[PDB]
Symmetry: D2
Subunit: 294 residues, 4 copies
């Protein structure tokens, strides 16, 4: 119930030699707090966790909890393929003072659903009271959950939310219908208004980094019966999303954060390549415009 | 596309009644048309996927169009789905739909063979030509037709001279918004019934659906609620529609709908055409019960 | 399977010639049945996807079948593809196939609508009853049908009474082995012409193909070469098969095959039925150059 | 220059103990069991080796031991792939340090990178290999990448690349790659189509199931060479009787459980989240083991 809301998928700022840029991480953490964000989702896919070591991920959970613990909600994405490695991160989450833990369906190899459940159970054990945020992610990983299976995942003792990273809003409504109390995060930014309409009660997203007030603006708008306002705001979010998909989403976002003075050097880690120099005009212009809106 | 304004709304994908010898049941087709009209439906999409077009002849599909037009022309809006894999067979139907006085035509993207997009484009231009003044509704339905469109291609498609409308049989609500942003005036039908409210909010301004045959007023209710900023009524109606869709998925959709309409005394014989099988007997009390829920409501 | 042994072989999937009015070209059709029997081909697979069945009416399809029965009956094996979405339509074509003296019938898995496995099986059973003794070739093409059967579903399918062959248009040569393991006397046609050599080794005991029309003797050469334990020539014949398929893919497979026959002066008009478009102007040189190529090595 | 890498390369399993720790005794044992089956070389730290539930140090430790047990005696290829370029670069440098003959890397996964980004990945690793040939992947089914033919041609021609691991069941494309690159070291990666894949143009393979019946695959390689098509098909069928079971049981564990009953690996476990093999299949697996021992 306290995990309900709009939660930024925190990006990982890197210095010129691809190491963790501490000062930029803190500025980005604070930049997000200033936006009226309800929380931070730290070390997810978005934070480039799958190109960081366990110690590099752990250094972030630390530096972020130090910056923002108590001021806004904090969810530690601890997911790895290896259960054991995930269990270490869950244990470090419980130390640093996070409010919750999360884990992507373990990927790369074919694991049965029953292996998934035992994977989450072991991380719930190592989490030590922290609620778990489960994934329904039939895309990036490559698995295909049904609906009885989803009911089993979300009612595993110790599970307190679902990150529904799917554009299937029939499935969303079904979830909400079965679990009226469930904390239920809309995972895809470019359908957020429709996802809340179908059953979600918040979201986790990467683009919240640069326009989080617009998502909070949509929440308010639908809450107040202002449907034209919700649509107009979502259309503004998608205008930004069209661009970012063209430029590469994480690097496009870091670059917009560079023109906003928050992130010193906009780089993603290799094998991600640079933002194509031809998109710099549009991106600085977007930063300008988003700076004009506050 | 602002000249196609009067095609806006909730259109039932009319089923085609068959008798126990698998022949057209014309008495029940007329009953079904009229029942759809009593329900306050905005119009009818005739001979679609839903109306089992692909297991009927051109002559059979033509007989259906004529009987619907006879019953309902001038009363509610009428859309003839004339699409075949063949462009010429398609044209034969677009001409007849004109002859019967239909308000518009439609065509599924021709399927099975791997047609290039500009071949798709020539297929359609030719049907609009044969349609002799009637506006056209184009498609996606990748799920059944196996045709995957890019954004650029969908723009060209809906901006071809004579296109009044897009049936968007796609659950991708990001693309719905992108279509709406680029085309504020376009008529944009939500194809998937189980996301209707969400599709409207993403930018659709109506829908075509198979379940509107049995609870069209609920879908109409959702349109009104969203216009009047009433999300709680919208969500409620969508949940009740999805409770039924849930059931219809278990039973087989077309034949579940036909059985509910049989228990509603509209459709004499609830069969779909082979190779479709009959409703599993175990499901009939649920469907009867449902018919009795819906009729009382 | 036992009774279908006589349908083991290399069978050209016949194309359907059309004139300038999009109507059927009857003399070119007969020009092709003849051109095919002089390649040493074991038979003809008639009215299939390749014969453009799905943009013709029932009437048009029967007409094609009746003609082919005039020209071939007895000489080369004759398989009629009678498959439609509708079971009742498929049955009409099946009965007609029996009337005209075909050796076999076949139907693609019914498509567009998601039908159940049980619904597929009843579809075949009805069609077979209407063929009235003519064995059935179950036709399996996932890429275009959208119908995706399990192995168990395929084993049940190929053992329905009256089924004597599987047409396997799949590149999954694991499954091609598995079906042979389970059914050692099934007539098993390789359906992707570009893997014929590999498919034979995995377990196809023959094939059905669009490209056999123009170069069917090469596939007999593979069967022969593998028979002779001659890996070299078989690989050679397949690379040569694939060189043509490469271009046939670029141009458009059906119309390319038709055009090649148009420069072989077998087809008057190399067009396909709309929505199929004409070929790009720029490929005519290669198609014309290829038609010349194949006659030289043949006759 | 390429041809020395040509042949039948087992994708080596990584044995673990009851605590998931690397089992070095069982790895030594398994490396020797491979060599004496008659294998041409070993593919170390691949997907088959549970690379993606190991840390870099664990992967380096495995590579070092195999190179000690096998340097000079058979070809060794070190799979050095990770998502991260820099992590892959460390592993590649380590492989060079340990005396491997080649390195490999799976197309980087999870995030969608571009084909340009994949090639730059391959460049950075190749550089870090400092002279070791690179084995590239064409993988549509386990990584999500959807490479084209012209892209594969660009891949196989990058400076330093000396082989393609064709982990695709598309034998039209196999034929197509061999026709375009008649010298290329081309490994069949889908074990259950090996013979057919050789006929389309592969000149060797890399597979997990070579750990228990590698002699069958060299026996298929031999049978085709002489033009004994019959024995080639008999062997592929026996390989697929095995591959059917392993698919039921779980391929890596299935395979380890058989090596356990061959007294090769002590503890037949995969790392979590892989569970153990179902106890019902243990009768079948023991039998396969006894069978395969008695068969040589
Ligand atoms: Cl994330
Ligand atoms: Cl429809
Ligand atoms: Cl065919
Ligand atoms: Cl591997």
């Amino acid at each position: 119930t306290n995990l309900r809301g709009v939660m930024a998928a925190l990006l990982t700022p890197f210095d010129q030699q691809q190491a963790l840029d501490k000062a930029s991480l803190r500025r980005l953490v604070q930049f997000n707090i200033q936006q009226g964000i309800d929380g931070l989702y730290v070390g997810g896919s978005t934070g480039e966790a799958f190109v960081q070591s366990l110690s590099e991920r752990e250094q972030v959970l630390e530096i972020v909890a130090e910056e923002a613990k108590g001021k806004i909600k904090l969810i530690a994405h601890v997911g790895c393929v290896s259960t054991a490695e995930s269990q270490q991160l869950a244990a470090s989450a419980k130390r640093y003072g996070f409010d919750a833990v999360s884990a992507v369906t373990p990927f790369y190899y074919p694991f049965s659903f029953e292996e998934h459940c035992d994977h989450y159970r072991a991380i719930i054990d190592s989490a030590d009271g922290l609620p778990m945020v489960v994934y329904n992610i039939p895309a990036l990983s490559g698995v295909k959950l049904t609906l009885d299976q989803i009911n089993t995942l979300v009612t595993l003792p110790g599970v307190g939310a679902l990150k529904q990273t799917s554009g299937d809003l029939y499935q969303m409504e079904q979830i909400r219908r079965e679990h009226p109390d469930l904390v239920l995060y809309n995972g895809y930014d470019n359908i957020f208004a429709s996802g809340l309409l179908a059953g979600a009660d918040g979201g986790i997203g990467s683009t919240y980094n640069i326009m989080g007030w617009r998502y909070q603006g949509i929440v308010k708008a639908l809450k107040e019966g202002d449907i034209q306002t919700a649509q107009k705001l979502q259309t503004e979010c998608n205008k930004v999303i069209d661009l970012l998909i063209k430029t590469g989403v994480f690097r496009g976002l870091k670059t917009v954060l560079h023109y906003m003075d928050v992130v010193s050097v906009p780089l993603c880690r290799k094998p991600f390549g640079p933002v194509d120099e031809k998109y710099l005009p549009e991106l600085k212009a977007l930063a300008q415009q988003l700076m004009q809106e506050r």
